[PDB]
Amino acid sequence: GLNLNTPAYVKNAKLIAWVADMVALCKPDTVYWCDGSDAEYQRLCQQLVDAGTFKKLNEAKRPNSYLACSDPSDVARVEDRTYICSAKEENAGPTNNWMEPSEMRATLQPLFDGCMRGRTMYVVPFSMGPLGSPIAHIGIELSDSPYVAVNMKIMTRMGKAVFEVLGTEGDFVPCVHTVGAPLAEGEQDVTWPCNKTKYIVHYPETREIWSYGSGYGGNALLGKKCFALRIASNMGRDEGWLAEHMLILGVTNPEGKKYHVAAAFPSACGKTNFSMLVPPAGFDGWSVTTIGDDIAWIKPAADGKLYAINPEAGYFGVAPGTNMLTNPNCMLSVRGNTIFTNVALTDDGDVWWEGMEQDAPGKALPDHLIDWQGKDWTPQIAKETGAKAAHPNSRFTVAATNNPALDSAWDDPKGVAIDAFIFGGRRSTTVPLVTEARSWVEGVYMAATMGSETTAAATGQAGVVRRDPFAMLPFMGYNMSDYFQHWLDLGKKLAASGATLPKIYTTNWFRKGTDGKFVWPGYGENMRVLAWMIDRIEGKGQGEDHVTGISPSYEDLNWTGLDFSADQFNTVTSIDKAAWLKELELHAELFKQLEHHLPKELGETKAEIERRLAA
Ligand SMILES: Nc1nc2c(ncn2[C@@H]2O[C@H](COP(=O)(O)OP(=O)(O)OP(=O)(O)O)[C@@H](O)[C@H]2O)c(=O)[nH]1
Ligand SMILES: O=C(O)C(=O)CS(=O)(=O)O
Ligand SMILES: [Mg+2]
Numbered sequence: 001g002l003n004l005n006t007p008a009y010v011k012n013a014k015l016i017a018w019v020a021d022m023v024a025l026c027k028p029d030t031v032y033w034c035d036g037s038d039a040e041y042q043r044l045c046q047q048l049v050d051a052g053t054f055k056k057l058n059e060a061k062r063p064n065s066y067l068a069c070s071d072p073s074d075v076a077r078v079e080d081r082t083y084i085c086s087a088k089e090e091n092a093g094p095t096n097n098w099m100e101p102s103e104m105r106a107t108l109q110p111l112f113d114g115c116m117r118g119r120t121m122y123v124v125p126f127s128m129g130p131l132g133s134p135i136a137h138i139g140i141e142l143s144d145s146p147y148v149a150v151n152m153k154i155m156t157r158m159g160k161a162v163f164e165v166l167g168t169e170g171d172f173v174p175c176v177h178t179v180g181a182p183l184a185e186g187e188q189d190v191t192w193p194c195n196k197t198k199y200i201v202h203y204p205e206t207r208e209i210w211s212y213g214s215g216y217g218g219n220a221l222l223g224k225k226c227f228a229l230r231i232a233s234n235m236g237r238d239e240g241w242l243a244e245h246m247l248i249l250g251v252t253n254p255e256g257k258k259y260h261v262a263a264a265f266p267s268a269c270g271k272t273n274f275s276m277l278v279p280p281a282g283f284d285g286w287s288v289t290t291i292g293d294d295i296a297w298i299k300p301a302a303d304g305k306l307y308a309i310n311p312e313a314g315y316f317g318v319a320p321g322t323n324m325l326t327n328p329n330c331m332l333s334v335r336g337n338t339i340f341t342n343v344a345l346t347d348d349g350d351v352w353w354e355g356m357e358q359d360a361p362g363k364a365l366p367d368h369l370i371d372w373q374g375k376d377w378t379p380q381i382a383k384e385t386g387a388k389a390a391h392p393n394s395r396f397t398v399a400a401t402n403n404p405a406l407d408s409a410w411d412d413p414k415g416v417a418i419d420a421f422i423f424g425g426r427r428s429t430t431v432p433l434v435t436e437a438r439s440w441v442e443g444v445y446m447a448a449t450m451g452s453e454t455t456a457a458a459t460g461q462a463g464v465v466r467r468d469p470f471a472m473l474p475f476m477g478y479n480m481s482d483y484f485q486h487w488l489d490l491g492k493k494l495a496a497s498g499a500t501l502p503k504i505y506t507t508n509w510f511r512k513g514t515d516g517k518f519v520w521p522g523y524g525e526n527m528r529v530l531a532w533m534i535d536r537i538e539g540k541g542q543g544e545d546h547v548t549g550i551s552p553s554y555e556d557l558n559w560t561g562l563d564f565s566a567d568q569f570n571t572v573t574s575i576d577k578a579a580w581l582k583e584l585e586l587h588a589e590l591f592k593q594l595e596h597h598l599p600k601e602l603g604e605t606k607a608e609i610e611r612r613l614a615a
């Protein structure tokens with residue numbers, strides 16, 4: 001067989017045998033084992049610069065940073081090409097794409113046979129969770145993309161240290177990735193190799209992940225969505241814990257009390273911005289710190305609390321919209337040591353994306369850019385055609401340690417206790433600014449039935465309302481109704497300790513006015529909603545009972561420093577009977593689709609809401 005170039009520190013015979021088998025299948029020219037060092041990162045970045053995949057940014061404006069632009073067919077997740085291949089179709093469920101596992105294996109085998117001819121296979125060892133901690137899991141991703149390798153260095157704990165934990169007998173999650181663009185002898189490569197045919201396949205019984213044809217984000221960084229949500233959610237269902245599409249933040253009030261909250265918003269619907277928000281005027285003495293911005297692993301303890309950890313090591317964040325007013329901690333995070341994907345290039349070798357003009361002299365657009373497709377871009381082109389200089393799903397990749405608001409426990413494997421959960425989708429209508437659920441069951445109902453308008457984070461038509469239970473529609477690794485039951489059963493376990501359960505809130509930052517602009521300013525002003533949640537956690541916040549739960553009155557929030565009237569508050573908090581009647585019929589359609597194993601508690605809760613609407 002091909003020389004694996006196995007390092008001496010790899011002591012795991014089963015791992016080596018699996019690599020050998022994948023090398024025999026994929027047939028790369030050579031094999032390279034990533035050690036995770038800073039020096040290797042620099043070498044791989046230089047290799048990407050030579051291929052044209054990276055441009056090195058101006059070191060005076062953006063130190064040790066790089067810009068990649070991708071093929072326009074490969075800019076986002078492809079949900080229709082993503083599969084849960086469980087043994088039984090009912091363990092994938094109606095929210096997932098299923099194929100009989102032997103039939104998927106026969107489909108993928110000819111695609112992966114020889115997929116890496118002409119390329120290097122990079123062996124990318126990584127830990128999700130702190131290295132060697134009781135809650136961490138180790139994965140090995142084989143990829144023919146050095147872009148994957150350098151992004152995994154930032155997003156995970158990557159490299160040779162993993163093999164001390166694996167030892168001789170440790171188990172690992174097996175991940176195989178190819179851009180699906182094998183190269184014949186002497187063939188010239190493209191700057192962003194990919195395939196218009198794509199598959200992202202999970203076999204839960206074996207924890208195998210196979211990815212074909214995409215080099216982009218969640219399709220190709222397999223530790224993130226594929227393992228730490230899809231495979232992990234399955235493991236959690238079996239072992240009594242949760243893997244959730246949630247930020248985790250700490251918030252300290254002026255009395256020095258610190259609380260932690262976990263919030264599930266759908267893809268490109270506000271988590272990263274919320275997870276490091278800066279308290280605005282009126283909140284002297286408050287602080288907000290980031291534990292994670294995207295994935296949370298959560299389990300209950302004997303003390304009746306829920307403990308959350310962030311299994312990632314960095315942020316893979318949406319760039320457009322980011323500036324010193326919307327997310328200054330993010331702006332400071334990406335000052336250097338960052339990879340940017342599909343943003344624009346300034347004449348001086350810096351990066352630009354829509355939204356940055358809010359910090360510019362005269363708040364004006366740059367005179368000239370190279371947009372993410374390599375085309376000349378100007379304010380005149382943008383005015384006449386609406387051309388975006390940065391793709392709407394353009395991303396930065398940056399280490400968590402760049403974040404000035406990073407929580408000191410961000411990598412503590414003991415986790416943080418969650419005092420409240422927040423769920424919220426992108427809804428132009430219907431859903432009020434913030435609602436507290438009256439019980440755990442009603443909160444699970446909130447989360448199970450939430451809707452959200454599609455975004456550029458996956459391909460397809462944006463702006464369409466769909467059901468997105470728990471913000472996990474693209475990421476649930478088993479039947480969604482069983483996952484609802486898991487959340488209900490978790491609540492009963494917590495309550496049996498005698499504890500008070502974490503409260504569950506619904507939020508909506510995204511109500512629109514008649515011109516399609518947002519009625520609520522959002523971003524740092526979301527602190528004013530968070531502060532009410534903290535008041536409620538302490539039993540000092542007032543609220544009014546309405547159809548869907550308990551909501552603050554105008555006087556229950558701090559408006560110091562924000563010009564937002566009681567009339568504007570009434571608009572975004574009023575419960576509209578007609579809109580909620582329509583919404584509950586969309587819940588009924590979801591419950592028909594999810595009939596199999598649907599918890600009866602959900603239909604019971606729906607009936608109670610219907611009574612309150614008809615009262
Ligand atoms: N109007 C408004 N826009 C927001 C708000 N928060 C975030 N956004 C915008 O929504 C987009 C997505 O925000 P993110 O915070 O990156 O979303 P995310 O949930 O982290 O998305 P993923 O990383 O894909 O899971 C960006 O363009 C933000 O500028 C908000 O409170 N109000
Ligand atoms: O789409 C999301 O929810 C993301 O966090 C980005 S990706 O990792 O799926 O590309
Ligand atoms: Mg994010």
Ligand SMILES: [Mn+2]
Nearest residue numbers: 245267268294
């Ligand atoms: Mn996400």
